[PDB]
Amino acid sequence: PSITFIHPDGRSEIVDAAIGDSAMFAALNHGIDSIVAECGGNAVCATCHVYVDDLWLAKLPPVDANEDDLLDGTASDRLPNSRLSCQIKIAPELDGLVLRIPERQT
Numbered sequence: 498p499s500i501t502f503i504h505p506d507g508r509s510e511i512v513d514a515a516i517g518d519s520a521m522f523a524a525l526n527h528g529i530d531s532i533v534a535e536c537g538g539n540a541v542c543a544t545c546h547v548y549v550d551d552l553w554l555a556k557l558p559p560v561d562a563n564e565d566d567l568l569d570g571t572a573s574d575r576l577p578n579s580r581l582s583c584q585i586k587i588a589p590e591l592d593g594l595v596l597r598i599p600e601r602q603t
């Protein structure tokens with residue numbers, strides 16, 4: 498599938514992603530440097546932060562208890578649609594997923 502990423506400035510990048518890649522993995526492996534991801538996809542930092550598009554949130558499995566507490570330690574304050582991009586797993590149904598990246602991760 499394919500994920501759309503949007504920078505603070507509003508510009509877009511379409512990145513390939515296989516089924517099963519996290520959104521972070523997909524980002525890092527196709528040139529999206531802004532996603533710092535200190536812990537390397539290991540669900541223990543708040544630095545792979547993203548905002549899921551208002552319309553795509555519903556299609557994702559819910560945030561768990563761990564991701565939820567991680568999210569209130571973000572560098573840019575959490576929004577309703579905030580997610581940890583290493584905790585988003587890509588599936589056919591997310592082909593087209595839109596993610597916007599915060600002003601900062603650290």
Ligand code: FES
Pocket residue numbers: 521533534535536537538539540541542543544545581582583584
């Ligand atoms: S990269 Fe550390 S939680 Fe996603």
